[PDB]
Amino acid sequence: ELHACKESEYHFEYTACDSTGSRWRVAVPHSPGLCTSLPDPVKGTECSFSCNAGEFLDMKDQSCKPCAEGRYSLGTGIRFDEWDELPHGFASLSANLENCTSSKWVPRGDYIASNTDECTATLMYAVNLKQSGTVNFEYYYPDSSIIFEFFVQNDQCQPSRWMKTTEKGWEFHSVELNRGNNVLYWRTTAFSVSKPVLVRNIAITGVAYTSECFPCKPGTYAAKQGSPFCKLCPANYYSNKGETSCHPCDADKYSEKGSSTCKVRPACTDKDYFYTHTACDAQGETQLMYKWAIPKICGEDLEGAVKLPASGVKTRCPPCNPGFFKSTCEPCPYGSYSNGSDC
Amino acid sequence: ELHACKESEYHFEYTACDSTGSRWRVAVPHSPGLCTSLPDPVKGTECSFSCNAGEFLDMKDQSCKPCAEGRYSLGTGIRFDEWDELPHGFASLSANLNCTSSKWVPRGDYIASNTDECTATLMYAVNLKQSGTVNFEYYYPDSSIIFEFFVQNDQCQPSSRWMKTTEKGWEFHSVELNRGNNVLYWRTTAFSVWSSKPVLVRNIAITGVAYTSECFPCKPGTYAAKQGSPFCKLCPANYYSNKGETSCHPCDADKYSE
Amino acid sequence: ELHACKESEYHFEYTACDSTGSRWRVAVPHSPGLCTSLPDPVKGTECSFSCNAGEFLDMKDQSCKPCAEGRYSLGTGIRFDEWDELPHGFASLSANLENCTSSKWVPRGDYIASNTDECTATLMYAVNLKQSGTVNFEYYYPDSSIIFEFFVQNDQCQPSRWMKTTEKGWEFHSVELNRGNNVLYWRTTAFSVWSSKPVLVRNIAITGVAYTSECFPCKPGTYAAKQGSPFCKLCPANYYSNKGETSCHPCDADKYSEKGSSTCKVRPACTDKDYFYTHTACDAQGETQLMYKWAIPKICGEDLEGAVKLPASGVKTRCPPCNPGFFKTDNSTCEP
Ligand SMILES: *[C@@H]1O[C@H](CO)[C@@H](O)[C@H](O)[C@H]1NC(C)=O
Ligand SMILES: *[C@@H]1O[C@H](CO)[C@@H](O)[C@H](O)[C@H]1NC(C)=O
Ligand SMILES: *[C@@H]1O[C@H](CO)[C@@H](O)[C@H](O)[C@H]1NC(C)=O
Ligand SMILES: [Cu+2]
Ligand SMILES: [Cu+2]
């Protein structure tokens, strides 16, 4: 009476994991009572198949496929790059150490920000790692006035906690996590003897045993298949969802790095160009050569825009730097002093 | 904020046929709100692609596949081999020429006509999307009863009318049909000569209906060996089988089976 | 490489209806392979959305819009107001009643006409109503010498069939139809031995066919003012119009226009046939004055040369004796 469903009406699904850990790849119709003669169940993977980053589990043949072009999988983990609001699951508990309740870890923007005043602002995440994994987050440590603590309390609530200062770049941090219900804690306190502490790209690995491919967000492009992270489109290039490559933008429009849509180039203003003076010539006269800022996003064709002023007239230089004798001054050797005219 | 649609979620489907006949193979999630970045629509068959008996339409590559072992497709047609009750769509209307009781009685293996002098009409109003034929096996043992099978047209205009005697076993008959809503009539009126054996009809097969159809598992007691079978062969006596079997298992020594 | 298509290329369309009756509003590019990231298909209406007369189904939002000005939608039905030739789908079958094959429903013009001679001329239409609907047709029945039969056959070809005679106006008729492949019949028999007057049928409108129609620009000579009009009103006399016209454009004085005329026609010069003579009532002295008048639909200009003017008349001429049974007074105004 019923049909014999083709490949389009029956989908593979895994049974409930037993005590030993065996699963059966049973065939299930998409809606009840639509077909019979389903394919016979076969042995599934032993409840621990974890596809690597950039891969998804194909049910037809139980193996990790390398995904498609322009799409990312994030693997058996999650990421918290967005910080417009507090991401779901994060608890921004703030308590006075002994009102600072209004002072807590605030979602400043692309990065979260710590409280500058003297208070205990804890950012806590409670994630149940089904598999052994690690956490990778980028933390900015501008000043030593506010201390940074990152300790993952374990499954039994059982507890090197302090993070060293970061210079120059954002730096990178990573700790190991076990299979227990690990609860991550990000807390900062100010001694009030300021510069807030910033956190970006919280990456927790070993969560769901399997993920699914995700289209690249606007402003992001992925070229090769199986990309754990979808790269960012360069400046002056726009993009959309699922774009394999960034489309070049028009000349009259300017685009920032990873921009969803192009923005019209405004007319150049007096603020755009900056004055400057170059070195002296053979006669001792320096020529001033006005320059535009390298993030030049304005157009000369548009009316009402001040052009780069015509400069370069040779103007006699003042006496050269002390300790330097000339008109290309060279460093006078040690043991001789110069005021700019003679050494 | 939606995951890219995997091969297992989106199910290819054809758009509504336009006036010219162009169709699009749009990709649709099995339930709304699941996927994004679905495969792009492509041109489909021109609203008239039909797969012969024993084949089905595979949407992935728009062509006819040979089905599989132990399954019959019936093609672009229907079949009414079962007669335990009156099949759906059949109107066993009987008009006096009271004879309300007399009509085409649906015996299990075959349908039997009336024996008395009452006009019993077995009507089937079927809409044929494609020009096809109707085939059936009619038993006509006695000539006192007159057997008429005439095809009415789409505009109800009448359209060889009578049938010949079927001596020496069941015979086979077939007439052509048309694009319209042909309405088939089976009628037998018995002359009151004070004497008859009712006319018997089996295996009504109408082709050209509903365009492509899907494969079905073989009915119990019937087996199919190779893919593409338009019908499941009957298992030999003393042997038995079940649904979907490619062969008939032998039976026990202390058991018999027709 | 392909780029995401702006709203100028992808058009919303409905997938094939399933057994339960659910559809998906898939966004389909106009030409294959031009874009990606198309809008996600959403749930459609349950395969039975029927916009009323004067409304069209908007794909952007699944609701019935009131159409635009100057255009009609005809609703979920069809109309057969044109009868210059036999409309497509109509079978004017003629058969002998027992050679009368020559007799059939002739498309005389804006109306169809039945056969005067003794023969059976059936006007058959086979329309598949996807929805329950009605048929509305105006029929003219001048004389009873020719009988009119209008019966609707069902899907199983299994059949009030006789129509009433019409006096004065064209009258209006309507019956009900089912969801089957209904076949409408219009036949006339001429059982009268001595003659005849043909039977006329106009404005056959069958509703409930395709579940949805599309707005159509109004034909020339027709204007539509309010949106959602299931018909375009005909322009009055001396007014011309064209396709999609919201209002009928007034014509020039030298040109005359019939009702529902696409283009104006130059007024010919007045001829002796245009005016008709007549005599008015008597005066107090018993003299009548004749006052020639132009015909009510007079079409001719006085300015054009070669046109005879309205002749000067009104000379008092003594009336003959008044009507029998009527006696005149001093004012010669006879009273009963
Ligand atoms: C105490 O904390 C509450 C919570 O934010 C705050 O509304 C209140 O102003 C504080 N009291 C002070 C600052 O005196
Ligand atoms: C008369 O017709 C009815 C059905 O309408 C039927 O049940 C009844 O048996 C008939 N009478 C005889 C005597 O057969
Ligand atoms: C009757 O005969 C044929 C069709 O049967 C037709 O062509 C012919 O004109 C008819 N006769 C007359 C007198 O019209
Ligand atoms: Cu499904
Ligand atoms: Cu490009």
Ligand SMILES: [Cu+2]
């Ligand atoms: Cu066996």
